[PDB]
Design a protein around this ligand. Structure first.
Ligand SMILES: OC[C@H]1O[C@H](O[C@H]2[C@H](O)[C@@H](O)[C@H](OCCCCCCC3CCCCC3)O[C@@H]2CO)[C@H](O)[C@@H](O)[C@@H]1O
Ligand SMILES: O=C/C=C/NCC(O)CC=O
Length: 265
């Protein structure tokens, strides 16, 4: 594999779309690679990690409990609810909802949680409160994946998302237990985690949240590192490409391969 930047460029050439990427040391925030880092990209399902960060902030303040059981109705369900559709009779706890939203990309679970933090506007205010003045959520679970060209709704930038994830996971804005919980939910991703591990060389740590939308939109926010350590935050977004999902996945994997083969920068 070529150098990371060379591979990112190759990916845009092959996909005919824009790639946005940041590679950052998790512990210090040192930026190693930045490509279209200040350009907007649809967050798609990656917004779910920030959502649960807001939920944990409420728990830390005593305004919420991960144990609290939420009962909902069938009419509350939206497209793709693998876990939440199984609990119309018994409900789900706030913590279970975050696990479902993050590890199974359950959209109804995400919407139920979004309601608890004041909706898209409330989540955006939370982002402003932790110093992210760029990321914005405007719509609910399914509609936010529309990815219309030039539409600023439901977007982030690679640099903003990386800084925000770092703040939630390590800045002590969240309590120690909450930072540990958010990390474990990412470690537990069932959608892409197992697959990524199956293709990673032995010794490489992975925690992640992925997402997909229209017009080729794709995204992944992840923690990656050798020696089984979450050394770096890697955020990659793709937008406006007509490529198959398989090729978009292969190109993201290719950027990962370049990182792995040239890690010591
Ligand atoms: O020299 C380094 C390594 O080179 C190869 O490893 C390959 C591996 O066989 C392949 O499967 C993977 O594909 C990349 C898989 C990446 C998957 C997702 C990455 C994510 C993670 C973070 C966010 C964005 C991308 O590349 C590596 C590096 O070339 C060798 O197989 C391995 O024995 C050796 O230790
Ligand atoms: O990103 C999180 C969930 C996204 N759901 C919609 C799609 O995956 C795109 C279908 O075209």
């Amino acid at each position: 594999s070529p150098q990371p930047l060379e591979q990112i460029k190759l990916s845009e050439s092959q996909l005919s779309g824009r790639v946005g990427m940041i590679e950052m040391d998790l512990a210090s925030g040192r930026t190693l690679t930045a490509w279209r880092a200040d350009e907007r990209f649809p967050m798609v399902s990656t917004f779910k990690v920030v959502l649960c960060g807001a939920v944990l902030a409420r728990v830390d303040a005593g305004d919420e409990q991960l144990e609290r059981k939420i009962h909902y109705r069938q009419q509350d369900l939206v497209d793709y609810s693998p876990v939440s559709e199984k609990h119309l009779a018994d409900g789900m706890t706030v913590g279970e909802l975050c696990a479902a939203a993050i590890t199974m990309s359950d959209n109804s679970a995400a919407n139920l949680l979004l309601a608890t933090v004041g909706g898209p506007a409330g989540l955006t205010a939370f982002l402003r409160q932790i110093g992210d003045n760029v990321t914005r959520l405007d719509r609910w679970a399914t509609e936010l994946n529309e990815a219309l060209p030039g539409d600023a709704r439901d977007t982030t930038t690679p640099a903003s998302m990386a800084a925000t994830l770092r703040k939630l996971l390590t800045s002590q804005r969240l309590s120690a237990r909450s930072q540990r919980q958010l990390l474990q939910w990412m470690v537990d991703d069932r959608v892409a985690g197992p697959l990524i591990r199956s293709v990673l060389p032995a010794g490489w740590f992975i925690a992640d949240k992925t997402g997909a939308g229209e017009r080729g939109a794709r995204g992944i926010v992840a923690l990656l590192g050798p020696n089984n350590k979450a050394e770096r935050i890697v955020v990659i977004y793709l937008r406006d490409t007509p490529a198959s999902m398989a090729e978009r996945n292969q190109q993201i994997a290719g950027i990962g391969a370049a990182l792995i083969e040239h890690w010591q920068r």
